[PDB]
């Protein structure tokens, strides 16, 4: 397993992302096999080889009920993995590829396999929150933003708390270098404000947070930051 | 010598 394995994985990803929804029905076997071999404790699968996660990230099939069952196993696997990753207590961040691939997977999976009605929702939200200095093109945090950008609705009632932290971190993130990070932050922030406006306008407590922030933030705004404030 | 508590 080397650069060849990685190229093979990305090749599979390209096939799925291009070819889809006509014969992609010979893969639940492949998915089950890959999940099983991943379940092997042997970390011979290299840290770079965590593209496997992006492989298990799937939107190319009906995703049958068996795959749905395995989705929960995958979810808990990611919960444990992010517990390991976030905790520097094990003294091994192992982020480079593992964290980003887990993010991409969890995105592709919880696209249609989750409701904001349970504790694991907020657990994964907390794990996402940590997206701190994150050098080497800041790739992993960016991915997570897209997850939130793709799943802002999945964290309802939990965008409320910690709002100011989310707001400021999103603001600075689109103010960084590496303009891809900036636009990812832009999209995530747009989804963020959309979702919070939706959840607040339907509240009874809307006034509290409404005054606590927003209008004061937007007025404090007064480059494209200004357009951000306009949309806000 | 170690006895009782100390043993």
């Amino acid at each position: 397993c080397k650069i060849p394995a990685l190229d093979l994985l990305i090749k599979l990803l390209q096939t799925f992302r291009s070819s889809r929804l006509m014969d992609e029905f010979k893969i639940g076997e492949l998915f089950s096999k890959f999940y099983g071999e991943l379940a092997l404790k042997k970390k011979i699968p290299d840290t770079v080889l965590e593209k496997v996660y992006e492989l298990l990230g799937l939107l190319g099939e009906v995703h049958p009920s068996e795959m749905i069952n395995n989705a929960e196993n995958l979810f808990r696997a990611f919960l444990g993995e992010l517990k390991t990753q976030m905790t520097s207590a094990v003294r091994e961040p192992k982020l480079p590829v593992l964290a980003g691939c887990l993010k991409g997977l969890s995105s592709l999976l919880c696209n249609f396999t989750k409701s904001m009605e349970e504790d694991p929702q907020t657990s994964r939200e907390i794990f996402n929150f940590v997206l701190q200095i994150d050098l080497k093109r800041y790739a992993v945090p960016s991915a997570g933003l897209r997850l939130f950008a793709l799943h802002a609705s999945q964290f309802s009632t939990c965008l409320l708390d910690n709002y100011v932290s989310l707001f400021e971190v999103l603001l600075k993130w689109c103010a960084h270098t590496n303009v891809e990070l900036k636009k990812a932050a832009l999209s995530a922030l747009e989804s963020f404000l959309k979702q919070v406006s939706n959840m607040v306008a339907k509240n009874a407590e809307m006034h509290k947070n409404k005054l606590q922030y927003f209008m004061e933030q937007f007025y404090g705004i007064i480059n494209k930051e200004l357009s951000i404030a306009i949309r806000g | 010598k170690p006895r009782g508590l100390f043993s």
Binding site: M86, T87, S88, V130, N162, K208 | -
Partner: protein, 69 residues
């Protein structure tokens, strides 16, 4: 250390591992009077000897910690 942690977990299987007690370091550390004696020679050697010069991970934290209508 293993025994104190095992004790804590058996009595409290709900809490993080207890930190190392300080008397542990006390018999791990030499008599502090020797340290006080060495302090000044430490400084003079440091001045006399010109020396020139990353952690794996400092995670499980993001930075440090968490009206009239």
């Amino acid at each position: 250390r293993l025994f104190q942690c095992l004790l804590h977990r058996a009595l409290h299987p709900r809490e993080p591992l207890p930190p190392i007690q300080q008397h542990i370091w006390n018999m791990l550390n030499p008599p502090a009077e020797v340290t006080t004696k060495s302090q000044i020679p430490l400084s003079k050697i440091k001045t006399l000897f010109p020396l020139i010069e990353d952690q794996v991970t400092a995670q499980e934290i993001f930075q440090d910690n968490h009206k009239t209508e």
